[PDB]
Amino acid sequence: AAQTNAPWGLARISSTSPGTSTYYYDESAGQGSCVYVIDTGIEASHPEFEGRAQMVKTYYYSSRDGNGHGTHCAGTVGSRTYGVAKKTQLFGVKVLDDNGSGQYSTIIAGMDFVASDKNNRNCPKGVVASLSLGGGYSSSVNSAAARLQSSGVMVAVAAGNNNADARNYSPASEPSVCTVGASDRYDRRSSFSNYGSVLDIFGPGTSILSTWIGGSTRSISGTSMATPHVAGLAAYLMTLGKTTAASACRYIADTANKGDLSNIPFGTVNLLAYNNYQA
Ligand SMILES: [Ca+2]
Ligand SMILES: [Ca+2]
Ligand SMILES: [Ca+2]
Ligand SMILES: [Ca+2]
Known about the structure:
Layout: E1 2-3, H1 8-13, E2 23-24, E3 33-39, E4 53-58, H2 69-78, E5 89-94, H3 104-117, E6 126-131, E7 135-136, H4 139-150, E8 154-158, E9 169-170, E10 178-183, E11 201-204, E12 208-212, E13 216-220, H5 223-239, H6 248-254, E14 257-258, E15 271-272
Parallel strand pairs: 3-5, 3-6, 4-5, 6-8, 8-10, 10-11
Antiparallel strand pairs: 1-2, 7-9, 12-13, 14-15
Helix pairs in contact: 2-5, 3-4
Bound molecules: calcium ion (CA) (4 copies).
């Protein structure tokens, strides 16, 4: 399958080369897999989600996304135009209030909620969680991401947009989960991207076009937009039976475009998420 004039990110994850704008993917498109977006919530009613998105949990007064962050990440995972896995089920878990921030205890509860809630969902192809959130190191937050992973969910987490070593952030610094840095359309490390030995993979992070609240669209930049790309790829790869929740991160890193990225610190992996799809 080929989507002409796709967002640069989608085109790049189905490319050996930068500078193309057609997304190539297997038409299965992550059907029968679920990606949990642990975020500000999802505008489920966005025509781009085609009824494939639902809010499953909130820790606030509304489950609505009054922010936009989580609607924009959800979109990069599995929206028809801006998604990697165009046929995946999106579950919205609102751990972040509409100002974009949330207590670590609430975030942990959200990660433990997904680890259980998946047993309440039809995800025969497997379960992915996209964590486009971060803060300071916390073993408790690290251990929550470890538990979600261990439970049989592929956990993808932003490295953080501090342009520092992600060893000092959570859940970015958790060894057992997929830590995602951000690249830009010219194959450069995004100036904001965290780095370090704890990074597993890079994703398109800079100027990521996706869905927004008010049934709208906009471009935004972060490791937070690299993550939904890797989250989605994992959903797509799992639906192809090409990997599992537990080994998805490895698989993605084994099959990644290697040495393609510039401004990658020594001792950080030079690996760009790649669907390795051959039309
Ligand atoms: Ca573009
Ligand atoms: Ca976003
Ligand atoms: Ca987000
Ligand atoms: Ca987002």
